[PDB]
Design a protein around this ligand. Structure first.
Ligand SMILES: [Cu+]
Length: 154
């Protein structure tokens, strides 16, 4: 069995010009490949922490309603090795988003695409913050492909 790929789609509105995607695809050796492709960032208030948060973005697009970080193993915001960070603290482990546009690829060995895992991130959300913590934009983590099953194509 292999678990399905996920995506978070950020859209531009009157609240934020940030738009683009963060894709999560199963990779080699027990890791998930993360692909960040964002533009429209308000650079001078960055760099921009971003994290997996615990609740969905509601229809209102209120990023506060995503509540706190996904942290099933009670990690710490400051850490000296990647595994000591919260599972959801992508920026702490891999770097803050920065610039007006940001494109990067990396592996994360703590998030999970397997819905039976305590580290599963499906159905959660991602929030992008200004450096001072203000929530700028957010997106739900949803399935990437439309068609699944061992007898299907997409
Ligand atoms: Cu966050």
């Amino acid at each position: 069995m292999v678990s399905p790929s996920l995506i978070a789609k950020f859209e531009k509105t009157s609240k934020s010009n940030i738009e683009g995607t963060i894709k999560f695809t199963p990779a080699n050796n027990g890791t998930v490949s993360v692909s960040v492709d964002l533009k429209g960032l308000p650079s001078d208030i960055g760099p921009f922490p971003y994290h997996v948060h615990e609740k969905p973005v509601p229809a209102s697009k209120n990023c506060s309603a995503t509540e706190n970080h996904f942290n099933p193993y009670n990690g710490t915001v400051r850490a000296a090795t990647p595994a000591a960070h919260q599972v959801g603290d992508l920026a702490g482990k891999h770097g803050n988003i920065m610039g007006e546009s940001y494109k990067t690829e990396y592996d994360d060995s703590y998030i999970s695409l397997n819905e039976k895992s305590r580290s599963y991130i499906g159905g959660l959300s991602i929030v992008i913050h200004a450096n001072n913590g203000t929530r700028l934009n957010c997106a739900n983590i949803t399935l990437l492909d439309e068609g699944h099953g061992n007898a299907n194509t997409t």
